[PDB]
């Protein structure tokens, strides 16, 4: 699955929770991020 | 979309001084001087090979002669291979995976 549509340039996802975040109309990651009413993060086998 | 890479810029062979002069150890007056038996010190070429070198003397000039029309020919044809392959060098172009 290495060469992806992307090209090899880009290896793995550059998403985060600022994107598609109705709550949050800026570009980059801000405290109201967290603020959003639909947002949770977890932690799981202690190593993700 | 695909990712296809940028064109390679062109390249111009002419880029750089060149210079063509003439190397003298000495000025020109120096050779005005006429020589002295201490001048003679060092011997010439001609008179360095003796009597039991000859044969091997000529053998090595003919061999020399030999490779020297090979080089020739070695570099007339790598010279004509080197004008037939174009910029673009398919066997050493580096491109991205499908």
Redesign the interface.
């Known amino acids: 699955h ?2 992806l ?5 880009i290896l793995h996802s550059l998403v985060s929770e600022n994107h598609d975040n109705a709550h949050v109309e800026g570009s980059e990651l801000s405290f109201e991020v967290f603020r959003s009413p639909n947002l949770q993060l977890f932690v799981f086998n202690d190593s993700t | 979309k695909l990712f296809v890479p940028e064109p390679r810029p062109v390249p111009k062979n002419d880029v750089g001084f060149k210079y063509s002069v003439k190397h003298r150890p000495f000025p020109e007056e120096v050779d005005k001087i006429p020589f002295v038996k201490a001048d003679l010190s060092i011997p010439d070429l001609h008179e360095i090979v003796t009597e039991e070198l000859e044969e091997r003397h000529e053998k090595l000039r003919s061999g020399m002669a030999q490779q020297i029309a090979y080089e020739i020919h070695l570099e007339q044809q790598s010279e004509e291979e080197l004008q037939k392959r174009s910029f673009p060098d398919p066997v050493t172009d580096c491109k991205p995976p499908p």
């Open positions: 290495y060469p549509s992307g090209g090899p340039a």
